RNA sequence: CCCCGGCGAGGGGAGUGAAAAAGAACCUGAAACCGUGUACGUACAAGCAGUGGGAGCACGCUUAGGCGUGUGACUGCGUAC
RNA sequence: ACGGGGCUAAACCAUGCACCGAAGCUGCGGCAGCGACGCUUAUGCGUUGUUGGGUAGGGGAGCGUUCUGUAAGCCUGCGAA
């Protein structure tokens with residue numbers, strides 16, 4: 001019962017090199033380098049599914065801060081005023097209204113200014 | 118005219134006719150959903166800000182599809198320590214089509 | 221009752237240990253022997 | 269109509285012939301014959317006999333006219349290498365590669 | 379829904395003019411770095427230059443506090459061995475006064491090809507005169 | 521001795537080539553970590 | 555058998571054959587490696603070369619839009635096994 | 636011999652209220668392990684509690700390859716490997 005390895009080992013190597021397309025040099029041609037690069041690309045992707053949630057909230061807060069300062073208030077007082085006024089809109093939607101509907105954002109600032117005063 | 122409602126632990130800004138992808142709902146395909154927890158309704162500089170909810174505000178939508186999302190590959194690797202393991206994942210969703218924002 | 225319908229009783233055909241066949245098997249790279257010394261060597265180990 | 273001539277197992281390396289084949293790529297064949305005449309390379313003698321044989325192939329086997337033809341494709345491929353043994357100092361033996369080439373000239377009036 | 383991204387072909391940039399007479403150096407430079415980056419706009423994107431053009435007049439009349447007019451020292455190296463060179467604040471004002479504000483703002487901008495393109499919108503002049511009247515700069519009382 | 525070399529069948533003792541202490545220009549002042 | 559070539563090597567036709575990219579360097583004809591063509595990127599730009607975000611361009615779709623494929627300016631993080 | 640720019644506070648001390656901040660906690664969806672109780676099982680389902688970083692190493696369950704039987708069967712020149 002002698003088993004030759006030609007068909008199975010070729011299909012295993014071809015599966016890795018298909019995932020290594022677009023990589024530079026031996027990282028897309030050579031199996032020893034490509035396998036090593038596909039594992040690192042999976043570690044980065046696992047890490048950046050956590051980092052993607054951090055970077056978007058960083059982008060929403062920076063946009064809320066800029067549009068709130070156009071109305072005479074900082075970020076930290078605008079968030080405190082919306083919590084006191086029982087408004088439960090999250091930072092994704094607030095930064096989206098701050099770009100696309102600017103007078104509806106003005107209505108939220110005046111709501112937050114009333115709850116602080 | 119848009120509105121803001123919460124569903125599936127997340128919030129969405131939708132309008133009439135728009136197709137929105139949510140988390141999985143236990144509703145059959147073709148059945149109507151109602152969202153009574155509406156957070157804000159804006160219609161041409163008349164803004165109803167809910168405190169937390171615009172009461173009297175309901176969003177109606179029609180379930181059009183279920184399905185699983187694109188496969189995500191999960192890779193864990195610890196160098197020089199003889200450890201790796203791998204895992205796949207597909208996430209369920211529900212597509213709804215917004216039919217009425219009634220303030 | 222055919223030649224492709226017969227089965228062994230459940231629990232009578234445990235599969236054997238195959239050492240040194242990758243990470244996922246739990247027995248790769250040392251075959252359960254640990255790192256160096258007399259007991260990890262081929263033909264190694266002290267007498268009775 | 270496209271017309272091919274080839275020189276297979278031509279005795280020279282592909283890097284040396286490719287210097288001469290990049291001179292005449294895209295040219296009219298009357299202009300390309302003059303470039304090869306005044307190029308002082310051994311590979312320019314090789315490429316000229318394949319270009320001359322492609323011109324004769326196209327007027328005899330295809331009925332084309334010589335004033336219309338252009339070199340649309342030209343490329344050199346690597347052939348089999350011959351393995352020789354070169355003695356070095358102190359008993360060392362090196363391997364010599366004697367590289368060959370496949371010259372392909374393509375002419376067409378279109 | 380994906381979050382809005384500003385597109386660099388349809389971004390609106392505007393022109394401002396700032397008078398640096400009697401301003402504190404660093405406190406003026408922090409506001410110039412916000413507006414060259416575009417931190418004051420709601421369309422702010424971290425990989426797009428959404429900032430403004432700013433003209434700075436009277437760079438030789440900027441102010442520092444303490445003893446920093448004689449004690450703040452600017453260093454550079456030339457690449458030749460033993461080639462460390464220094465200059466005090468008073469000598470940078472006397473010799474090339476526009477560099478004082480340009481060096482201060484450059485340290486507050488991001489580092490990379492986008493931060494070098496944000497620096498190109500700063501126009502610093504040692505006197506009261508600029509020749510950018512065709513761009514109609516707005517007076518920014520900052 | 522290397523008796524069945526196929527790349528170099530003409531030579532059996534080749535350590536005068538690559539081993540540094542067996543070359544003709546080896547000097548014992550290279551071995552000064554004593 | 556005809557043509558180019560040195561009465562060469564090598565090739566192009568013609569013909570045989572189910573097939574000649576089965577032509578004697580001959581079944582199938584993988585990979586490293588080396589080329590030709592096309593799309594996009596690249597000559598003010600610093601590092602394990604990916605990953606997360608993302609403009610523009612090209613080709614397909616199908617529409618009263620924004621999807622698919624290729625490329626990836628710019629930007630966050632990131633020192634192989 | 637602040638990470639840099641810069642800073643006379645953007646330093647230090649005391650008090651106070653906001654906000655940022657992790658794979659911690661919460662929300663929504665999904666999978667699995669071990670207990671307990673059950674529409675009743677025939678050993679699977681339902682409810683609920685809890686758990687799921689991991690080297691050496693121990694335990695459990697699988698994929699695929701060649702060969703023998705089932706197979707003088709089944710697929711295949713209307714195209715097998």
Ligand SMILES: NCCC[C@H](N)C(=O)O
Pocket residue numbers: 530531532533
């Ligand atoms: N006795 C002499 C044998 C020589 C041989 N070719 C060698 O290299 O040893």
Ligand SMILES: [K+]
Pocket residue numbers: 251252253
């Ligand atoms: K053991």
Ligand SMILES: [K+]
Pocket residue numbers: 576
């Ligand atoms: K064949």
Ligand SMILES: [K+]
Pocket residue numbers: none
């Ligand atoms: K090949």
Ligand SMILES: [K+]
Pocket residue numbers: none
């Ligand atoms: K990057």
Ligand SMILES: [Mg+2]
Pocket residue numbers: 237238239240
């Ligand atoms: Mg074993």
Ligand SMILES: [Mg+2]
Pocket residue numbers: 246
């Ligand atoms: Mg183990």
Ligand SMILES: [Mg+2]
Pocket residue numbers: 253254255256257259260
């Ligand atoms: Mg031991």
Ligand SMILES: [Mg+2]
Pocket residue numbers: 255
């Ligand atoms: Mg060992």
Ligand SMILES: [Mg+2]
Pocket residue numbers: 256
């Ligand atoms: Mg030890």
Ligand SMILES: [Mg+2]
Pocket residue numbers: 262
């Ligand atoms: Mg032994």
Ligand SMILES: [Mg+2]
Pocket residue numbers: 261262263264265
């Ligand atoms: Mg022993």
Ligand SMILES: [Mg+2]
Pocket residue numbers: 355356357
């Ligand atoms: Mg010699």
Ligand SMILES: [Mg+2]
Pocket residue numbers: 359
């Ligand atoms: Mg000799």
Ligand SMILES: [Mg+2]
Pocket residue numbers: 529530
């Ligand atoms: Mg001999």
Ligand SMILES: [Mg+2]
Pocket residue numbers: 572
């Ligand atoms: Mg046939």
